[PDB]
Amino acid sequence: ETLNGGITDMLTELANFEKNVSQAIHKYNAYRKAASVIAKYPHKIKSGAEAKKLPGVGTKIAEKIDEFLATGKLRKLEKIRQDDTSSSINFLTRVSGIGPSAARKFVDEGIKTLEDLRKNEDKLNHHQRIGLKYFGDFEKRIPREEMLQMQDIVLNEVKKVDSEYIATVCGSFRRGAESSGDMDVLLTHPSFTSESTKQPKLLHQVVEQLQKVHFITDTLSKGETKFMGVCQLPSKNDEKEYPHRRIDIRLIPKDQYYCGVLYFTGSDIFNKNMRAHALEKGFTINEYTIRPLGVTGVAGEPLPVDSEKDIFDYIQWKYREPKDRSE
DNA sequence: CATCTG
DNA sequence: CAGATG
Ligand code: NA
Ligand code: NA
Ligand SMILES: [Zn+2]
Ligand SMILES: [Zn+2]
Structure with missing residues (x-):
């Protein structure tokens, strides 16, 4: 250490x-x-x-x-x-859409910089382009003060879109952090679960509003469950516009939220510990659920969860406020 | 892992 | 469909 x-x-x-x-x-x-x-x-x-x-x-x-x-x-x-060639890569990689694979390429194409990019704005893909456009903002940390503003707005329309929605902004933002990299919002609905067949609208539904109302400006990937996009707090009284921050909405089965909600909140280390002890009280937990471990070495079976309280309870443990969920 | 690209 | 990215 x-x-x-x-x-x-x-x-x-x-x-x-x-x-x-x-x-x-x-x-x-x-x-x-x-x-x-x-x-x-x-x-x-x-x-x-x-x-x-x-x-x-x-x-x-x-x-x-x-x-x-x-x-x-x-x-x-x-x-x-x-x-230089090494350096270019690590640098291009800095873009949202630029992985080492694409990095390697462009370099061997001469594109080695940010300007290069713009020039050869054609060779970029969509995502690849947005990342360029918002290159800087994207590198800008998100201070809590902004986060709650956002968070607020999100929550009001998810509400309007339908009262049954259960949105939840996780991360460190939830862990009580002062600055977060992106807004990673959790989404479920009653009408969405484990067995319940599809229902894409459940997601697209909201994706509109947020757009409808200028909250979301660009889409980076939009599907039935996951939505990778860009959003923006309406710059108030013209002289100051916010940045474009990254956002992510994911539609989950109501039957396996708090496991996820829990999960996503972190910190990794808190997880690990809760996960080890879990193992102690005779269980296992994962990004989707919590279940009973049969002595046979192992065993399945999903335990039902109505809240983070259900989970804790299970492995018999002190419910920890998300603030005290670091390690 | 889910999405998009080609 | 592999293969990329996040
Ligand atoms: Na990148
Ligand atoms: Na291969
Ligand atoms: Zn020693
Ligand atoms: Zn995220």
Whole structure:
């Protein structure tokens, strides 16, 4: 946690490069365990020979750790840090719609910058284009003050669209955070569940309003359940317009919300812990449900949930306000 | 994972 | 349909 940091950090460096730059999924994958293993490893790694001892770690890496130990830097890492071609990728990747795959391409096409983009605005895809258009805003964090404004508006129309809707903004925003990356809203309806066949409108329904009323400006992907879009708080008294922030609406079966709602809220770590103990009280929980573990090694069967309160209760645990849901 | 692209 | 992205 600070005892074999830089080493973990460079391994990570190496890992990401290989993956995104070249296609070293394996090497990449390697970098990763390695960085994962030294991560837990309780001692002061005073050598590669000592590293290697480790599992996942072998011959190549130790070369590296040693150099980093011996001297304060990695030549190959240093040599990587400069290469424009590497840098372009990691940079283009910065776009909403630009994965390393597309990154790699454009670069080999000369497109290496933001301007390049605009120029060759044709070679971008839709998503790809919006990400460009909102390149900056998209990189802008969302301060709670804005979040509640938004949250408010969302909730009022989901209400109008139909009174039976159960929307819920999760995330850290829910975890009580001061700034959130995007608005990730949970959606269900009574009339939507596990077995209940389809009902796309359940989603498209709302997607309109929000648009209808200018809340949503652009769609990034719109389907029956998931909607990946862009929204905007109506710039008040003209002199200040907000940014375009990312939003995501997902329609879920009423029969498996609070499991999801719970789930999505985080933090990962809270999850893990609740998930381990869950395992203790004789259960398992997942992104959709909670069920009874048969001794046979394992077993199914969905437990019914009317609230986060149902779930907690189950594994017999202190209901934790979402504020105190960090770790 | 669900969506879009080609 | 694989393959990409998020
Ligand atoms: Na990207
Ligand atoms: Na393949
Ligand atoms: Zn030690
Ligand atoms: Zn999100």
